[PDB]
Swiss-Prot record:
The chain holds residues 114 to 333 of 333 of the full protein. Zn(2+) 4 binds at residues 92, 96. Zn(2+) 2 binds at residues 50, 86. Zn(2+) 7 binds at residue 162. This is Cathepsin L. It comes from Homo sapiens (Human).
Length: 218
């Protein structure tokens, strides 16, 4: 359980992406985790198709630009036996008809692991496994206009999450509660710290970050 962790440094994270005006954070989150877990199994980092997820994973109970869960996406790739590359199946930001092509598949998974609902367990996973899909409470002006430092919103909810993101590490600064999660959001590089956000860690599961954490098995 190193005191600090950043999976970017290890070649597990792709660049920050833009979801645009569409309810598909859950897709970006899930390709984030799959990107890293594939990169652990194979050492090739390949960007994956959110459009594929948005378009094709209705049967798993996702709902395109109207929402879905990372767990349904991980299911979809198991159910479907593959997921296409970003290059082969580019992000359109609407919801179209399934064009999944099995010949351009680059990732597959054998299920997913739901993390216990605690920050200690999250931290283990982030340190042992790689980047983790999580859901957070992002329904606040403060998040929307975030810019730097350690995000703390007194109004944030431990259990009512409305946005999926990726945890790519954690660290601490240099008075009292100094610790944070390194979180990769999908709103383009403009937003906050290069598209990233240093969420408050170990302050009572702030924004519910530890509350629906998972990753795929590959
Ligand atoms: C992520 N972009 C997102 N968007 C939305 N909505 C935006 C469009 O208007 C409806 C809601 N909702 C979620 N969301 C809640 C949810 C909706 C539908 C389903 Cl099948 C599952 C969840 C997610 C909750 C789980 C963590 C990610 C956010 N997300």
């Amino acid at each position: 359980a190193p005191r600090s962790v950043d999976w970017r440094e290890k070649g597990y994270v792709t660049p920050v992406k833009n979801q645009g005006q569409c309810g598909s954070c859950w897709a970006f989150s899930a390709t984030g985790a799959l990107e890293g877990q594939m990169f652990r199994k194979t050492g090739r980092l390949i960007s994956l198709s959110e459009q594929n997820l948005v378009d094709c994973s209705g049967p798993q109970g996702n709902e395109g630009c109207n929402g879905g869960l990372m767990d349904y996406a991980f299911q979809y790739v198991q159910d479907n036996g593959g997921l296409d590359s970003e290059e082969s199946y580019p992000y359109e930001a609407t919801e179209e008809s399934c064009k999944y092509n099995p010949k351009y598949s680059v990732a597959n998974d054998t299920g997913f692991v739901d993390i216990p609902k605690q920050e200690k367990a999250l931290m283990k996973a982030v340190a042992t496994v790689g980047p983790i899909s999580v859901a957070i409470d992002a329904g606040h002006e403060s998040f929307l206009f975030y810019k730097e430092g350690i995000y703390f919103e007194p109004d944030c909810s431990s259990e009512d999450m409305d946005h999926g993101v990726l945890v790519v590490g954690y660290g601490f600064e240099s008075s009292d509660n100094n610790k944070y999660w390194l979180v990769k959001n999908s709103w383009g590089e403009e937003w906050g710290m290069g598209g990233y956000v240093k969420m408050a860690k170990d302050r009572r599961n702030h924004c519910g970050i530890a509350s629906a954490a998972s990753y795929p098995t590959v």
